[PDB]
């Protein structure tokens, strides 16, 4: 509908959105970004990597308009003062995730459909290069940085044409907890339920 | 006082608004959607990458004279 149901992080999730989490429905940017926000909230706890998530508009914008077009999006946050940078990626009718881990010192792309996109990682490393200059006025040290993409046999793949967003989210969930990705397609239906919960509650079970 | 805002779209069409610093942008957003004839939950209003909420004010966001508000559309994927 239009009726707001839950709300935080200066965001508002409505019934229309929550419904996208339903059975086999394609999730929308509202769910992804809200969920991503909860992960960044939880990242405050000790024992967890500090995390910063960009909204699902950043990468596309950064890819089609260049750095000069998103440089001000990070005006109130020092990207390099966190451990993990979450980059949800929208590919028109499919969802993906790119993750910058300054600790492991590498940029890895995650696709539940087996795609590769190492280009996405190059775009991001370039980004890190422009930020380090625009914001910290020094030149980024790429030494040791690994740009790669997880292979279909390395991470749980989806078996339908809808859970892409779900995998993206859960991948980040596990990644943000420094825990091995240990779920499968079989869990998706549950995960969807647990999220309409977690979101209306604003708390990650 | 007042601030001059420019709400731009992907098509680069720009709508101008004259708003007052200490005022909820929920209207500017509501006006825009009307001039476009689309439901509120159809667009997202970002100021320098930041999502503009109903109870957001140019003063809080620190918007300046002649600033831009970019409008994005809903993204979905399977």
Swiss-Prot record, chain A:
Q: Which GO terms describe its biological process?
A: negative regulation of proteasomal ubiquitin-dependent protein catabolic process; positive regulation of transcription by RNA polymerase II; proteasome-mediated ubiquitin-dependent protein catabolic process; protein desumoylation; protein sumoylation; regulation of definitive erythrocyte differentiation; regulation of mRNA stability; regulation of postsynapse assembly
Changing residue 72 to A: reported impact?
Answer: Impairs SUMO2 processing activity. No effect on SUMO2 deconjugating activity
Q: What is the effect of changing residue 93 to A?
A: No effect on SUMO2 processing and SUMO2 deconjugating activities
Q: Where, by residue number, is the motif Nuclear export signal?
A: 196-205
Instruction: Tell me the impact of changing residue 2 to A.
Output: No effect on SUMO2 processing and SUMO2 deconjugating activities
Q: What is the effect of changing residue 90 to A?
A: Impairs SUMO2 processing activity. No effect on SUMO2 deconjugating activity
Record's keyword terms, sorted = Cytoplasm, Hydrolase, Nucleus, Phosphoprotein, Protease, Thiol protease, Ubl conjugation pathway
Changing residue 57 to A does what? Impairs SUMO2 processing activity. No effect on SUMO2 deconjugating activity
* Region described as Protease: 11-174
Give any Gene Ontology cellular component.
Answer: nucleoplasm
The entry lists its GO molecular-function terms as: deSUMOylase activity; endopeptidase activity; SUMO-specific endopeptidase activity
**What is its subcellular localisation?**
Nucleus; Cytoplasm
Give the UniProt tissue specificity note: Highly expressed in testis. Expressed at lower levels in thymus, pancreas, spleen, liver, ovary and small intestine.
Q: Where is this motif: Nuclear localization signal?
A: 135-138, 189-195
Active-site residue list? 94, 111, 164 (nucleophile)
Please describe what this protein does: Protease that catalyzes two essential functions in the SUMO pathway. The first is the hydrolysis of an alpha-linked peptide bond at the C-terminal end of the small ubiquitin-like modifier (SUMO) propeptides, SUMO1, SUMO2 and SUMO3 leading to the mature form of the proteins. The second is the deconjugation of SUMO1, SUMO2 and SUMO3 from targeted proteins, by cleaving an epsilon-linked peptide bond between the C-terminal glycine of the mature SUMO and the lysine epsilon-amino group of the target protein. Deconjugates SUMO1 from HIPK2.
Family indicated by similarity: Belongs to the peptidase C48 family.
User: How is the quaternary structure described?
Assistant: Interacts with RBM33; promoting ALKBH5 desumoylation and subsequent activation.
Q: What is this protein called?
A: Sentrin-specific protease 1
Residues represented out of the complete protein = 440 to 644 of 644
Swiss-Prot record, chain B:
Main localization, broad class: nucleus
Associated condition reads: Non-syndromic orofacial cleft 10: A birth defect consisting of cleft lips with or without cleft palate. Cleft lips are associated with cleft palate in two-third of cases. A cleft lip can occur on one or both sides and range in severity from a simple notch in the upper lip to a complete opening in the lip extending into the floor of the nostril and involving the upper gum.
Q: Which part of the chain is the Ubiquitin-like domain?
A: 1-78
Subcellular location as annotated: Nucleus membrane; Nucleus speckle; Cytoplasm; Nucleus, PML body
The record lists the effect of residue 17 to A as: Abolishes binding to PIAS2
Protein name (database record): Small ubiquitin-related modifier 1
The molecular function terms of the Gene Ontology recorded here are: enzyme binding; potassium channel regulator activity; protein tag activity; RNA binding; small protein activating enzyme binding; transcription factor binding; transporter activator activity; ubiquitin protein ligase binding
Q: Where is this cross-link: Glycyl lysine isopeptide (Lys-Gly) (interchain with G-Cter in SUMO1)?
A: 6
In the record, Phosphoserine modifications are located at 13
